């Protein structure tokens, strides 16, 4: 639950999900939930551990 995860294979695609959100519909909600995961982890001051 309360952890990060490796993020190449998503960040690699998370643009191409958006190049791939034309043939079949993955929504703007799948990219932002992918995103909102990230902003949560950004510390206010630190380069989060």
- Which residues contact its own copies by CB under 8 A? 25, 27-29, 32-33, 36
- From the CB of 35, what's the least distance to its own copies, in Å? 10
Write the DSSP assignment of the chain as a string of letters. Answer: --S----HHHHHHHTHHHHSTTTS---HHHHHHHHHHHHHHS-SSS---
- From the CB of 24, what's the least distance to its own copies, in Å? 11
> In the complex with its own copies, which residue's Cβ is closer, 23 or 47?
23
Chain Cα centroid distance, residue 47: 18
- From the CB of 10, what's the least distance to its own copies, in Å? 14
């Amino acid at each position: 639950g309360r952890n990060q995860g490796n993020t190449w294979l998503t960040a690699f695609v998370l643009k191409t999900f958006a190049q791939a959100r034309a043939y079949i519909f993955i929504d703007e909600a799948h990219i932002t939930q992918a995103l909102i995961w990230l902003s949560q982890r950004q510390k206010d001051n630190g380069c989060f551990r």
